[PDB]
Amino acid sequence: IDSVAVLRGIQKVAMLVQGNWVVKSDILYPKDSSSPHSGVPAEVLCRGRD
């Protein structure tokens, strides 16, 4: 698999932190999901993870 395609694919679902790639917050927490421990909406979880 070409490196450019993998890079373009990972740029849409991940962010660069200290040279490494961390998955985006909205990917782990969909809009209809909630915190399994507190039940807060997924938007707050995404803001906290960001």
Next chain:
Amino acid sequence: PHAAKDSSDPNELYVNHKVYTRHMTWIPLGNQADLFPEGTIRPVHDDIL
């Protein structure tokens, strides 16, 4: 009445949610108010949950 939109921590959402022993109020009987000055009759640690 005034809290954040999320307020995940119970401290911001609710008030008096943890009943500490400091809420105990000594009620004088008869002349105990005159014999005992204010602040003497009270819980020892004042922080027991």
Next chain:
Amino acid sequence: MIIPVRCFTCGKIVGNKWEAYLGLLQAEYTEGDALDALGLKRYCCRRMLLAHVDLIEKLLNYAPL
């Protein structure tokens, strides 16, 4: 369910040192150094605070409210 006020063996007041202990868990302190800083020399209070499970919030999650 909830942290007991008195220690079973000795009887030292331990209910008031629970939430602060949780603060020491919210901080970078480990278990042993936090129990030492709280003033628990004998191991009975250390067992009381360490082996205690906080089930009151799990029950309040099922409370009527």
